[PDB]
Amino acid sequence: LGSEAQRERRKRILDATMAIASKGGYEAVQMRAVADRADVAVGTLYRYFPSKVHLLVSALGREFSRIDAKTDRSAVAGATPFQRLNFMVGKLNRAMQRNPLLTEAMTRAYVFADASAASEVDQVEKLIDSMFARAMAGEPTEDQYHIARVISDVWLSNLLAWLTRRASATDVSKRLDLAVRLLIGDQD
Amino acid sequence: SEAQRERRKRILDATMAIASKGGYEAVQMRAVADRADVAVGTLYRYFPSKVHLLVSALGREFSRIDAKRSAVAGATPFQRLNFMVGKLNRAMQRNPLLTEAMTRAYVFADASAASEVDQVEKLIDSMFARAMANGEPTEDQYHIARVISDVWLSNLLAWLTRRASATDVSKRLDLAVRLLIG
């Protein structure tokens, strides 16, 4: 399904969405402005992404997909599940902390995305869960996927506290370390 | 004092009435003050912003749920915690617009409302921590409760947006509880 022309259009649309959110945050991300920056027809934009929530959640899914594909796992080749999980948690954290305004825009879209964006939210959730489950495992068990979901929930809550300046990066790291210990502490 | 407690009550009652009608967007400072029959200044003294107002309203909801144990003595820590989760789930599901208003304020509350957010988090964590204990909980139980509160918030957001059914939410919290305490 699809074409090289469609993949090229989608890449430009998401690049434009991220460029606009990096400069002016969630509020700056508007359909007309994104269409103009990506050099795509507004109608074509609406067809692939029916709203700014769809654009931002799709940009977030692409970002997690890139982190997953590009993270060098040789660094923890001889590490324990506890170390591998803390490594991936640390990698996702540093990636989100790099551009606060952009992270804030994608997170806002993700937290309040409606049912019409279920496929885009599921792609995000499955990617983060897969990264944590594979770190704890290789091919994970159903229990490792259930643990991964809990860690993702703790990660999201702490990301929200960090974005709003209610928690420091230090506070976030300590809270995530505690959750990992409570779930798999005996795996080190 | 008496008059102060009555003024805060009227302010929070007006907030809830407005939120129940039109959600987060309907809640505005002037409208709340007029409905509560308080001066805008009295409103700002206790609640510096609409975010402080909605997060404080959320704290009163949790406090009232907490106020309303003897019936669950015979049950195990696992069963008491699942019962507490069920009560909190049902309470938030009864009035979607009111829940949406309080959740939106809680999620995006800034550093200036940190005190109110911290108090709300302590209230929900204590409800879960107390459910797993007999008497005062241990630090380990409060840490477990914080993880349960994070799972609960994530599932509440999925439920509010029609991405998870009430059954889905129940099953996910059951799984998290099982993973943490057994």
Curated annotation (Swiss-Prot), chain A:
InterPro entries: Homeodomain-like_sf, HTH-type_TetR-like_transc_reg, HTH_TetR, KstR_C. Coiled coil: none annotated. Controls the expression of genes used for utilizing diverse lipids as energy sources. Homodimer. GO terms for molecular function: DNA binding; DNA-binding transcription factor activity; protein homodimerization activity; transcription cis-regulatory region binding. Gene3D superfamilies: Tetracycline Repressor, domain 2. One of its GO terms (biological process) is regulation of DNA-templated transcription. Residues 30-49 bind DNA. This is HTH-type transcriptional repressor KstR. Keywords: DNA-binding, Repressor, Transcription, Transcription regulation. SUPFAM superfamilies: Homeodomain-like (SSF46689). PANTHER family: HTH-TYPE TRANSCRIPTIONAL REGULATOR RUTR, HTH-TYPE TRANSCRIPTIONAL REPRESSOR KSTR. Residues 7-67 form the HTH tetR-type domain.
